Amino acid sequence: RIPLQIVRAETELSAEEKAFLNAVEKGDYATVKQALQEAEIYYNVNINCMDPLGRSALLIAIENENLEIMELLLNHSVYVGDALLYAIRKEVVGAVELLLSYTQFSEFTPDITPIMLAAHTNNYEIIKLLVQKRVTIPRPHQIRCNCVECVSSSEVDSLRHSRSRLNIYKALASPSLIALSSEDPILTAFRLGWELKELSKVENEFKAEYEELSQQCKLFAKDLLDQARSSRELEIILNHRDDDLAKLKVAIKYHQKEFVAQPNCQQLLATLWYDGFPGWRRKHWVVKLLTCMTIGFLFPMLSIAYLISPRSNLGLFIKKPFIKFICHTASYLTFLFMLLLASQHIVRTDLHVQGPPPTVVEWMILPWVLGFIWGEIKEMWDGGFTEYIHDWWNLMDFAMNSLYLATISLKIMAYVKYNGSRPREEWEMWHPTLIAEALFAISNILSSLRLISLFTANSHLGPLQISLGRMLLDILKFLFIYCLVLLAFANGLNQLYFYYETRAIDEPNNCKGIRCEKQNNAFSTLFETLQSLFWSVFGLLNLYVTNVKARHEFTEFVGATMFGTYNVISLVVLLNMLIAMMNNSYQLIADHADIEWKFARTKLWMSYFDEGGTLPPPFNIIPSSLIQNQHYQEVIRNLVKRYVAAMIRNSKTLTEENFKELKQDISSFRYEVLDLL
Amino acid sequence: EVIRNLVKRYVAAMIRNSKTLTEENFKELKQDISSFRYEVLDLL
Amino acid sequence: NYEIIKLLVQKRVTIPRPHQIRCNCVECVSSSEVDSLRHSRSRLNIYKALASPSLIALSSEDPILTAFRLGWELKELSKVENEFKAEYEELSQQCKLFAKDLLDQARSSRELEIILNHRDDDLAKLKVAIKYHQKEFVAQPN
Amino acid sequence: RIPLQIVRAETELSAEEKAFLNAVEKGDYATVKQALQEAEIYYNVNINCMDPLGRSALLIAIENENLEIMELLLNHSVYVGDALLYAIRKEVVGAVELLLSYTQFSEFTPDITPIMLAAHTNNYEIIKLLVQKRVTIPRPHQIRCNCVECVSSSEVDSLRHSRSRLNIYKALASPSLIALSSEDPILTAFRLGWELKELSKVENEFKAEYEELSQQCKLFAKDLLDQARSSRELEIILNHRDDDLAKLKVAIKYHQKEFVAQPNCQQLLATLWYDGFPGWRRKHWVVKLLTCMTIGFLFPMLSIAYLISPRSNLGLFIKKPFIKFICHTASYLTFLFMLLLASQHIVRTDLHVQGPPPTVVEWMILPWVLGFIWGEIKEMWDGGFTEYIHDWWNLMDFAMNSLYLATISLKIMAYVKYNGSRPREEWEMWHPTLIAEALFAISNILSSLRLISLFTANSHLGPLQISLGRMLLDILKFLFIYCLVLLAFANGLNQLYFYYETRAIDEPNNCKGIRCEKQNNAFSTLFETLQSLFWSVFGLLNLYVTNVKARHEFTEFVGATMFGTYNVISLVVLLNMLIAMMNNSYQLIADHADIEWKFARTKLWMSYFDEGGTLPPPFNIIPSSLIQNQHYQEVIRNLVKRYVAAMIRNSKTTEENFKELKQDISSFRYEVLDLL
Amino acid sequence: GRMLLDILKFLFIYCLVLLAFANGLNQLYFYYETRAIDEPNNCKGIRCEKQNNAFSTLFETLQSLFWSVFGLLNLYVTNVKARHEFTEFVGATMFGTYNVISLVVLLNMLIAMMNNSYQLIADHADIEWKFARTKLWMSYFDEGGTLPPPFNI
Amino acid sequence: EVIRNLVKRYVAAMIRNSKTTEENFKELKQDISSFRYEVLDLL
Ligand SMILES: Cn1c(=O)n(CCCO)c(=O)c2c1nc(Oc1ccc(/N=N/c3ccccc3)c(Cl)c1)n2Cc1ccc(Cl)cc1
Ligand SMILES: Cn1c(=O)n(CCCO)c(=O)c2c1nc(Oc1ccc(/N=N/c3ccccc3)c(Cl)c1)n2Cc1ccc(Cl)cc1
């Protein structure tokens, strides 16, 4: 037996007052009209009867969109508090226009203003109605501001301060409002969406809300570009400078990947990319291969012509984007081929010469190594240090070029110090000629791996190269946990085995460590222990490394159980988890694979449009308006007109509330007919 | 006092969400029109 | 339906109180032995009514403690009355959502402080939320 | 400039008739009255107009459910053929009842009859109207009918014959038509669902449709059990014998898994399973663990008491299913423990004793061994051969007793023939004692693996064990491809290396093969080549087995390339492909894991319900009416009403619906305007 | 952490499989045990430079079947001094069947299960992490326990 | 001859399938509103 009773008692409503609410819904005017006329002198009933749910006299009329009755109650001087907000949310234009012709529980927070609520709805007609009468929106402060006004508000009421800012940005990011009161709608969406994404990181509490707003600004700019009907319209939009392809460049700066990947925008770029060959798309796959191979071979010939006679017909040939890409790639391809040839041409007798002179291959490589450094150095100035770090591929080019300078320094330095030939077996561990060779070989791996960035140009391999690269970030997080486990077990195993370290003189072949034919001293030092646990991930550490010379059966068993537990945690738990998180991340990435690849290829293409850097690495070392704005505003006017019509149609292409309205309309008509004679 | 306000705000929101179509609703519209027709025909 | 529940509750009404999760009450053993499938159904019917957000917001002294305690108890029934695990689990999710949605209507930092610092007999109410495993309530952005 | 024209032209419609067809949509009595009254005896025009899209006078009224214009048009003696089918499909009860009392283009195939179409729509009301009048449905022949009519009909028109059978089965599987006119709605749904499942296999071209019909029958029976409101009603349903728990036994036979897994049916079963322990569900986990150990450790006492005093108080405990289950499990564990004690007890001196006598452990274990054979023999005899093969675990049990028999026989032979003690190192390859020890050890693995079948009794292990068994069928299919790959590469590698075989005496330690410290002769014979390629999957074959004594560099390189290509196909392609197949398979199985596991546990529980076979194997061998139908029919009637009422309301909770509302207002507008 | 709970359920199946094959291999090889003195360097077991007596005792057999999961047990441990070809072949087939059931079947099924779990878990990761972080933060709100261990006393 | 019958069956089936929103709601509301004006102005 659990008795149930109203706990938070609320003042009840009289029977006659209750009939009024039915009277308000009744559809008759006299019953209310008599009450209001009698109420003025009688004082029997207050006109603004307050139902427990808070639907006062005005609100009940607005709910069903009854303008006739709404005006009936309106003229009697009934309460006019916050009824405009209820009308705006309802979206009944008639009620809003009529209303505009002028505790307290509310369903709206105190910061909501009529214009802000209208923008949240995205109703073009209602927003325009309120804009015609002068209105304003408060300007949001900067993301990172120590303003005295901003600081106090956060301290006084943190909850209200956060909600207010979100409400303001929802209004500002409304597509209908931007299309109405924005001078340059495309630029506004770019800036607004970028700012909304920055707030998605600082305001971590409501990151989901700000990302939804950011995505809605991105889609509006793309949808405005979808309305272009002619190639002239597209070119005017894409070449506009606020104060070539200037607007497209701004989109890349703000990461408008959907805007860039638009098919009509992509198709225009391909016309500039393939300038030399008008009918590239129609050509067969086999014919393309010969054409690309043919052009690459003449790359030295095309490059020289530009150097000597830039205005020559042949000289201008290397000025086209796609052909320049082939000439730059062909040059880099012969550099890599030469490195593969470095071993063959060397002679055995030179194996004993300390600090020899450069070889034939080294001489050939020399011009390009300098050219690579010069190219990277020049690129640093334009983009700045901050930009230079954004691209990982650019980071790799840094390591390869630094190592080449070190190889040159040591090779020359060894030339000065040493003069004769000595047996290489007698050289010290840190001989300059030995260190130089190691650094050169490390550069060769980096140089060859750099070729993978060229997969962006190809359409079959580009999307996969982009998807594989985006899986690496998730691998990086998983590497944090593995390092913790690797260090914990390395400390334990070294702590137990360092008592039994032996000397190389006592080992079978004078070899100490795990790189010997008979492995030993696997856990003698911490540096060796980390190496041993790394090599066990691939099964390259033998199980007899757990025995000690003096057979201590307890110590050997404990050490082997440490090794066994590490193997389970690594190869049966951690490795399998990384597979599962890889599978999850891949599935999400595939949805955006096409757009992400098209954004990457656009950057690759636009990097070949400018004249600077036309000569490949080997040859770049040789020493020898109001009218424009007027046309933009005309296309923008037509673009917005088509967008407004299209969305209105899309909306009308359902709900219980709609069912109620139809039911009331029949009842409203029914009452008049019966009363009507 | 605060719990009173939270309940009132919560109650109002859910009612709006509830009214925001099943087959049975279609029958009601048909029935409403049917009743109107009969009275008017009988009505002079 | 809030309106109909209030209409009946105005007229003095009652709902039977369910016996604890484990009870050897003589009525309890007799009912289960005499007719199972009716003892089990009646128990689920009473808990569905008590887990109603409208019946909790109205006629409950502390709507948020009721939701915490009720939701926790329904999860316990889910493990024991394993024959009808899903039904109890769905009811438990209902109570957790109602408490979080109640906290979603706070409009000032003052209101939030009063709710989360209330001691039924600092952050006392939040400590009760952690003890009952009210994760959505604790994870609310405000 | 493609020119577009009406390639397949049809006779046009006269202007006056176009308004009429619109008029028949309008609801104008005058034009129809004047038309026929102007044409019935003038003969100027035929009122049975045919719209180009197939619509006619009767159809247009039916579409909007306008009975008056429909009723108005019928009395004029207009054409009626196939009107009932359109009315039935529309599901307008008034239209149908109006038609019952009085090559062309049709939207229905010629085999469809009014009763079949009504059943396809599952409209309870319209079906009852037709059944009240005498109607019939042709009986579908068996799946494999050499009947002349079926043989002839299939040859004449296979397309028509196949569609006729499917149409008849869609009607016979209608829940409304089973709840009405079926003596036993639950039994009919069981048999129909099983037959439809078999039909799916035979007619491979229409497996999807027959599966859907089979699944719909299974749901109907489960929903009738959902309408039970008391425990008394539930027991009547599940214990009915058409001519204990007999009805539930029929459900297990037909694989009605959802029926058996219904929470109320499962609750009643748990009460019979936990007889001794009324409050097992509420008990703590620790007390639960302690309780079973007590029963397990007392099974020899419980078992003996049953034999001496079956009717005494201590004898009834081993009769309770859950206690009996614990007694059998404890007995099987002591046998397994004795198996692990065989190695420790043996003595060194006995090593060289050819054909020894049974040891202490073999004496203790022997009672179990005979019991296991006796138990499996009895189950096979009564169960039947076909039932035995259904369970995979049954196959493993048969092999376990086969090996245990061979071990006993061989040791018996060894004792009789061999007399003295000789060193083991001098024994031949196939000495009887050596074979007996090998066969005994193989059985031990099977005996321990048999324990996995007891996971079904556990609520945290059973669902996983059931999921694992289903992934095994996906693995089996992938094995066919691997075997062909393994055989193809084995033949190629052996065909290149059999010229360089060497003798064992010419090897380092006189060891030949891949199980020596220095592996050799890895591809000298086909039998060895298969082993080498198998052990390569686990990385246990070293790369130096590709070299030959006479250094033929070309031959060695080609052999190592065969080995490398086999490695890529096996460990990079096929193995990774098996992971992808399994990952998808687990997703599908996981959804139905709960129902599948509950069905498996029910068969286990019902295994311990029977009075026979209570004694565990160690002691398995030792010296020495019309009223029932009436109650079932009353309960079935109540269930049907609740089901029909629920579905009628549940159904009532499109473009055509929009037109009906639009038409209703327009009709009101026209009459009102005409009305003064 | 939430994935570890599903791995534990897999250990039950693997443990019983590991015990069934360890029992069989030990039951077949225990007649051919040798003494450490008779072995090359006086070392006995599978941790020696030349592994031996892999299946001589039950305790050692369990360790050998564990180390074969990681490929660290050589295949010649299936031979005996008195070369009984039938016995050696049966022991190698026991070892082979264990490898198939473990590394081809059981290990793959564990990958399939862990894949299903991660998808289900990922939907509530944010809520569960925030619950965990709240408990961590509240532990530092109390005045007690302020001093770290080294100054705790 | 067979193609003629196949096309006829297909056209009927798709039409039936097709007929089985806010724009629809607006159209329905117009009928009642227009009807009321005629009745109000009807003699
Ligand atoms: C990590 N580990 C290892 O290092 N070495 C190498 C030792 C030096 O050679 C081993 O030889 C070894 C090992 N782990 C092994 O199996 C298991 C298998 C399952 C287990 N728990 N399951 C659950 C616990 C809680 C809930 C559910 C399941 C534990 Cl705990 C161990 N074995 C084989 C083994 C060896 C000897 C004996 Cl007596 C028993 C087993
Ligand atoms: C099967 N195989 C093998 O048995 N041995 C052992 C030989 C005896 O020791 C090897 O040493 C070996 C090998 N397979 C190797 O790599 C590749 C990698 C990719 C390849 N195609 N990709 C594409 C074809 C068409 C479209 C796209 C991709 C082919 Cl074809 C081979 N290598 C290493 C290697 C060795 C020498 C040279 Cl020159 C090159 C590579």
Ligand SMILES: Cn1c(=O)n(CCCO)c(=O)c2c1nc(Oc1ccc(/N=N/c3ccccc3)c(Cl)c1)n2Cc1ccc(Cl)cc1
């Ligand atoms: C477990 N196992 C093993 O231990 N050793 C080591 C022996 C001692 O060194 C092996 O050498 C070995 C092995 N398993 C092997 O392949 C298969 C492959 C598939 C199979 N069935 N598929 C299906 C059955 C029914 C339905 C569908 C598929 C069977 Cl049955 C065996 N092989 C290689 C091999 C060796 C000799 C001959 Cl004659 C044939 C094959």
